[PDB]
mmCIF file of C-alpha atoms in Angstrom:
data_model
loop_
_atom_site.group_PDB
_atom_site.id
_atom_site.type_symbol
_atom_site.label_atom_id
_atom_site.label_comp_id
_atom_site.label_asym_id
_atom_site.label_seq_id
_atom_site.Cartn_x
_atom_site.Cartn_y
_atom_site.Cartn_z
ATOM 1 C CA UNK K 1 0.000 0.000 0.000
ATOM 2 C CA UNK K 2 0.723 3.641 -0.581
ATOM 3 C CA UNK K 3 1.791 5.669 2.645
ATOM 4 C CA UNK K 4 -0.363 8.469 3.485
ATOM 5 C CA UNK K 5 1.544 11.793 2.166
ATOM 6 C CA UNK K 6 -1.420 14.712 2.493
ATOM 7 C CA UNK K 7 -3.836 14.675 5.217
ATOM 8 C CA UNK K 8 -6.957 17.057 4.729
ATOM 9 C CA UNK K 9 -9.017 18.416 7.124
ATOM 10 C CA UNK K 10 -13.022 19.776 5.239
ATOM 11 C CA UNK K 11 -14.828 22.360 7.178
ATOM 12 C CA UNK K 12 -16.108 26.224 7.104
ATOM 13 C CA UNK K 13 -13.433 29.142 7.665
ATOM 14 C CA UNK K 14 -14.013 31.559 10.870
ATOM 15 C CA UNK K 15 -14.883 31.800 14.227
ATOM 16 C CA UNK K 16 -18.323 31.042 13.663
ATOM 17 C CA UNK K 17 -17.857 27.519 12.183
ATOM 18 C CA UNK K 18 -15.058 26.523 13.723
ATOM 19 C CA UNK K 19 -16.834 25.143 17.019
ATOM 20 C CA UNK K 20 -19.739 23.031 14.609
ATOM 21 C CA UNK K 21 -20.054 19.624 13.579
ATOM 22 C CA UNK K 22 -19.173 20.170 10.108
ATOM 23 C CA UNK K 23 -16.042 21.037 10.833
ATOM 24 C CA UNK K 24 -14.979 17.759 12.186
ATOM 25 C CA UNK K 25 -12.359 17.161 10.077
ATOM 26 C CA UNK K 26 -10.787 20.521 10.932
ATOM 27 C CA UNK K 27 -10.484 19.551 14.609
ATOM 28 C CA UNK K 28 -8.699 16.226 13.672
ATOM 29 C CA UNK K 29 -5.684 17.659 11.391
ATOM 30 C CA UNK K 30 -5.566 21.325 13.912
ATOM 31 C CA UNK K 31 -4.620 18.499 16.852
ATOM 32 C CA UNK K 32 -2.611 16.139 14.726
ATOM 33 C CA UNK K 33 -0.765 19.149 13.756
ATOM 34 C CA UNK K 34 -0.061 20.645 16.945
ATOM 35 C CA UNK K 35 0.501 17.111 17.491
ATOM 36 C CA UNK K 36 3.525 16.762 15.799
ATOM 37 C CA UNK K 37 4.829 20.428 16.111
ATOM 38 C CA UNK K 38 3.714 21.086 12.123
ATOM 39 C CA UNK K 39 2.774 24.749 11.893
ATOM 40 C CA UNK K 40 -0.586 25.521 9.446
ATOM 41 C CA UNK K 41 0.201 28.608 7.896
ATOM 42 C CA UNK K 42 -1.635 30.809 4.701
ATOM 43 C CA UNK K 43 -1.542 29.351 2.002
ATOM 44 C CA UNK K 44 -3.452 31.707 -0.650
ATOM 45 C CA UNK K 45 -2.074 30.477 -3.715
ATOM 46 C CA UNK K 46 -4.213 26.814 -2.663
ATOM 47 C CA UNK K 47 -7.056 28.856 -1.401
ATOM 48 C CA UNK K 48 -6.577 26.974 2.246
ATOM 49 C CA UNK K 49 -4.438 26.714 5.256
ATOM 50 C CA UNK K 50 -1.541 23.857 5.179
ATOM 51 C CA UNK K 51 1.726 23.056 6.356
ATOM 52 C CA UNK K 52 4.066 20.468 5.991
ATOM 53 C CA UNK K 53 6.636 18.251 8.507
ATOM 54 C CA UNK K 54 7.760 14.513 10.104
ATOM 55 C CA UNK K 55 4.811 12.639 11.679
ATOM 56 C CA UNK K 56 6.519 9.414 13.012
ATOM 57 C CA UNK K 57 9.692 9.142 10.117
ATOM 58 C CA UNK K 58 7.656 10.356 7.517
ATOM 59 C CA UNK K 59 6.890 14.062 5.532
ATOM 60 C CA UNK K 60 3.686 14.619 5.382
ATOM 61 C CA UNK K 61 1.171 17.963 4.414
ATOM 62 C CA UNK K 62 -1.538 19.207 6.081
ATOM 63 C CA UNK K 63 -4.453 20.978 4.339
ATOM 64 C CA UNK K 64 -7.628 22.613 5.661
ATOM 65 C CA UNK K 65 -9.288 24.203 2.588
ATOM 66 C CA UNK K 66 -10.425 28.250 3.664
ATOM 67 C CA UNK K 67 -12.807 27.795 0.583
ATOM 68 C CA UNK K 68 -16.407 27.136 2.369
ATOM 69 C CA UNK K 69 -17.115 23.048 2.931
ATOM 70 C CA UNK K 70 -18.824 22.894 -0.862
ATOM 71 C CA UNK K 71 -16.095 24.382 -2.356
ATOM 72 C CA UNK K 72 -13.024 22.186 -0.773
ATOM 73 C CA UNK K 73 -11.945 20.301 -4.600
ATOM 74 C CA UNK K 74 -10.863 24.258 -5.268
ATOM 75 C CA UNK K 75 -8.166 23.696 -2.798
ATOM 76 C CA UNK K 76 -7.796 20.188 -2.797
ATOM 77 C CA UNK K 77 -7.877 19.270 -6.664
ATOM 78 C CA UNK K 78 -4.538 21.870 -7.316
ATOM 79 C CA UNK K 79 -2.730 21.217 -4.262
ATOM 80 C CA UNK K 80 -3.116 17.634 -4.696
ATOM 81 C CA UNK K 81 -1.749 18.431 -8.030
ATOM 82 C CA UNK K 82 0.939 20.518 -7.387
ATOM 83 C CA UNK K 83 2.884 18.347 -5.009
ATOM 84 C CA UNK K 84 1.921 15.300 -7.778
ATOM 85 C CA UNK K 85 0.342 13.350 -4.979
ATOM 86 C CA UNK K 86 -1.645 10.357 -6.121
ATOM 87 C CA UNK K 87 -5.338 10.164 -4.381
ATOM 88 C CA UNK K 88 -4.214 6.728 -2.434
ATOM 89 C CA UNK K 89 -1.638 8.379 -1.054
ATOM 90 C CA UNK K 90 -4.597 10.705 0.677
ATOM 91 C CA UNK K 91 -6.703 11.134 3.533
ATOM 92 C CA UNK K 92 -9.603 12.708 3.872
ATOM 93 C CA UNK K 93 -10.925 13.811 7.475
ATOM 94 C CA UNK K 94 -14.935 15.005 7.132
ATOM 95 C CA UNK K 95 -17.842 14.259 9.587
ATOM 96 C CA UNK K 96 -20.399 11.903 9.402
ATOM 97 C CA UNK K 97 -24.083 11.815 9.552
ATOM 98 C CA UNK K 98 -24.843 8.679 9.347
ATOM 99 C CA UNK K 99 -22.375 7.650 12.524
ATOM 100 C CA UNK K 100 -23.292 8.707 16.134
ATOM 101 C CA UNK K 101 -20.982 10.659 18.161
ATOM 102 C CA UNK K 102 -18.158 8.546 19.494
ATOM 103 C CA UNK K 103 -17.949 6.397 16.240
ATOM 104 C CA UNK K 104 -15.017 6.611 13.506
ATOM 105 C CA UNK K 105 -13.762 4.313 10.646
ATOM 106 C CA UNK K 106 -11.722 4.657 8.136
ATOM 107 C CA UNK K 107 -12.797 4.217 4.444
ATOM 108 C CA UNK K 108 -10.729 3.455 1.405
ATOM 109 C CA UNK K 109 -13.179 4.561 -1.753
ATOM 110 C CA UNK K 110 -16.657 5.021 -2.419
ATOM 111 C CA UNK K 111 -18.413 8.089 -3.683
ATOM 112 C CA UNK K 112 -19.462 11.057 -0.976
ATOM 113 C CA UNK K 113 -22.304 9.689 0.714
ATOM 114 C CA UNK K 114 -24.160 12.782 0.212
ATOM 115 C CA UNK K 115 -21.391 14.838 1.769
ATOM 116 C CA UNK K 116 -21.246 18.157 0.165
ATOM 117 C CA UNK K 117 -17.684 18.822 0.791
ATOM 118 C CA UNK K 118 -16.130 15.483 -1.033
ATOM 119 C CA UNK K 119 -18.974 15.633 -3.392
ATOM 120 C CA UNK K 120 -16.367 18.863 -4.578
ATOM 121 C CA UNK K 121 -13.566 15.925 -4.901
ATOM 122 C CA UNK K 122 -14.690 13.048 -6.011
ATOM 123 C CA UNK K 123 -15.415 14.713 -9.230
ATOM 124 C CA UNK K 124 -11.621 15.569 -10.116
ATOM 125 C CA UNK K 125 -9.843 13.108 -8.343
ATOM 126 C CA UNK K 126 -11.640 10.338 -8.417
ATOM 127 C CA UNK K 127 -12.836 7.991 -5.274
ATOM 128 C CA UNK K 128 -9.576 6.253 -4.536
ATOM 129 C CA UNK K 129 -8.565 8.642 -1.794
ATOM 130 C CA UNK K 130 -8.979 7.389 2.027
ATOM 131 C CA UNK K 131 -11.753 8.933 4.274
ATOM 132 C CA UNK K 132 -11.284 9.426 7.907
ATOM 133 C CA UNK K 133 -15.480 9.398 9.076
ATOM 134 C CA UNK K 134 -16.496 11.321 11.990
ATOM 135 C CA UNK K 135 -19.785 10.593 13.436
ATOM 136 C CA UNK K 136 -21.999 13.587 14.754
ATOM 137 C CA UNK K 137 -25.028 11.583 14.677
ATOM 138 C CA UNK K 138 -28.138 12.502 12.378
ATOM 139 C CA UNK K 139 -30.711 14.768 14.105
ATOM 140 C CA UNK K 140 -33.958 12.893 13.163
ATOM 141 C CA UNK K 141 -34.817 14.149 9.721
ATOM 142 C CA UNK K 142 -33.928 15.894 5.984
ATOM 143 C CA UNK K 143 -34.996 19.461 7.137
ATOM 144 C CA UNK K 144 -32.784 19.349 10.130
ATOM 145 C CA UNK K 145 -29.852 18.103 8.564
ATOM 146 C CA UNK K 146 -28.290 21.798 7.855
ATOM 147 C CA UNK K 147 -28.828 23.133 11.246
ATOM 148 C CA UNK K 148 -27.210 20.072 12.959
ATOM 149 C CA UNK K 149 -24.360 19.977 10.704
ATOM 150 C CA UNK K 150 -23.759 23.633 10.878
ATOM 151 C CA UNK K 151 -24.377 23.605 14.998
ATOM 152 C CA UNK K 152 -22.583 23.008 17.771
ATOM 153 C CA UNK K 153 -22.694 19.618 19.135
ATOM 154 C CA UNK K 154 -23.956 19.549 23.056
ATOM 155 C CA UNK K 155 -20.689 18.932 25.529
ATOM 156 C CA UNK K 156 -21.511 15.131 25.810
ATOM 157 C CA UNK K 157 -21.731 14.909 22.065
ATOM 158 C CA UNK K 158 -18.665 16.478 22.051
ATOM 159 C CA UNK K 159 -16.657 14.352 24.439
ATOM 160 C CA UNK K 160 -17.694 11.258 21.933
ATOM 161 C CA UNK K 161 -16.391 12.916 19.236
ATOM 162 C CA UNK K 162 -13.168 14.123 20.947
ATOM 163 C CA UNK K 163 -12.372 10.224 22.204
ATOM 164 C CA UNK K 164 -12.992 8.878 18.695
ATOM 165 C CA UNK K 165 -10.658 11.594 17.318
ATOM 166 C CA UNK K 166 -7.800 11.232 20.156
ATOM 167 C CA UNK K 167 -8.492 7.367 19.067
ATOM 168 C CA UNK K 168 -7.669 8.157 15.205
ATOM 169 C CA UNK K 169 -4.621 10.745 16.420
ATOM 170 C CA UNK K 170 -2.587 7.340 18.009
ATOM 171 C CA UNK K 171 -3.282 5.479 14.056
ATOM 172 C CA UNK K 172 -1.604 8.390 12.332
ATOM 173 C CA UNK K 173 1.580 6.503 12.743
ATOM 174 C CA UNK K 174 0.222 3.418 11.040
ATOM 175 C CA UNK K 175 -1.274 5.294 8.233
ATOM 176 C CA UNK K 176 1.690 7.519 7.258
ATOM 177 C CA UNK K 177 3.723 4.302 7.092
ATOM 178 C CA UNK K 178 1.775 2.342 4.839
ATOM 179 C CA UNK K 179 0.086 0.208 7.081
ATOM 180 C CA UNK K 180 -3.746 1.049 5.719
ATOM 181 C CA UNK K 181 -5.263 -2.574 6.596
ATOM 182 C CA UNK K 182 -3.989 -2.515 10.188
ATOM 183 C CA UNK K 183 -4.528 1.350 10.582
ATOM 184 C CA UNK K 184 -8.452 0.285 9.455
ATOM 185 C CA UNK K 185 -8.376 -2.772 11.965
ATOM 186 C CA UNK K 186 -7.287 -0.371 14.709
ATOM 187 C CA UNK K 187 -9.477 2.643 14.395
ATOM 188 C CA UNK K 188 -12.842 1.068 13.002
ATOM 189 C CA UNK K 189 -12.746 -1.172 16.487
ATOM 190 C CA UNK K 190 -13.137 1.665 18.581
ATOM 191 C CA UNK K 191 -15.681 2.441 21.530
ATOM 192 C CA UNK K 192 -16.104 4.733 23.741
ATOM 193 C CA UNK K 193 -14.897 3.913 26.860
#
């Protein structure tokens, strides 16, 4: 298998959004890079946030795309393309609907599930990229969907969510090393304790 070269966080830019569900993914790569001492800086010319250093032997980049969740292939697609890295060398961190709080698994293909922010990617990359899913839960029906995703969760929602994510943070090393199969053994067996 490929190592994992580019880890991408999808959510909303500013203060407002950066406490919601939807910006799951955000959390995940802001701790794995503080993490590992990487710094996120500007990165204008990718219309995002990234930054690049050793996780566990390896050189890695970071990405949070600034360009609003249903815009994230306009960072993703030419940064990706830049740097020349392949989509299974990728991994995608997004949140979930259709897992609860406290859940996480790793995926490897597929199309976007109805997720608006790698619906943006699949189209130019294709599906072969890796997908770190973050449940939030679902909150009941259609019509609520956008104010759930685009809320924040309640602080025993959040403590869920922050286990399954300090969970994924201890795979990284497995991931960025090549070790996909055991890296998907590892985090999709997770509980809450």
């Amino acid at each position: 298998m490929s190592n994992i070269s580019l880890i991408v966080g999808l959510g909303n830019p500013g203060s407002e959004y950066a406490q919601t569900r939807h910006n799951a993914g955000f959390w995940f790569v802001e701790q794995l890079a503080d993490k590992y001492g990487i710094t996120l800086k500007n990165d204008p010319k990718f219309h995002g946030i990234s930054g690049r250093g050793n996780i566990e032997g390896h050189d890695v980049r970071l990405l949070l795309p600034m360009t609003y969740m249903n815009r994230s292939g306009q960072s993703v697609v030419p940064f990706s393309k830049f740097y020349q890295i392949a989509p299974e060398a990728i991994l995608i961190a997004h949140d979930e609907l259709d897992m609860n709080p406290g859940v996480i698994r790793l995926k490897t293909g597929g199309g976007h599930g109805g997720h608006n922010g790698l619906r943006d990617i699949v189209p130019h990359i294709g599906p072969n990229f890796h997908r770190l899913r973050i449940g939030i839960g679902h909150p009941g029906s259609k019509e609520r969907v956008s104010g759930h995703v685009l809320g924040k969760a309640p602080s025993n929602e959040q403590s869920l969510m922050d286990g399954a994510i300090d969970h994924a943070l201890s795979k990284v090393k497995l991931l960025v090393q090549g070790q996909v199969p055991q890296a998907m053994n590892q985090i999709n067996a997770y509980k809450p304790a």
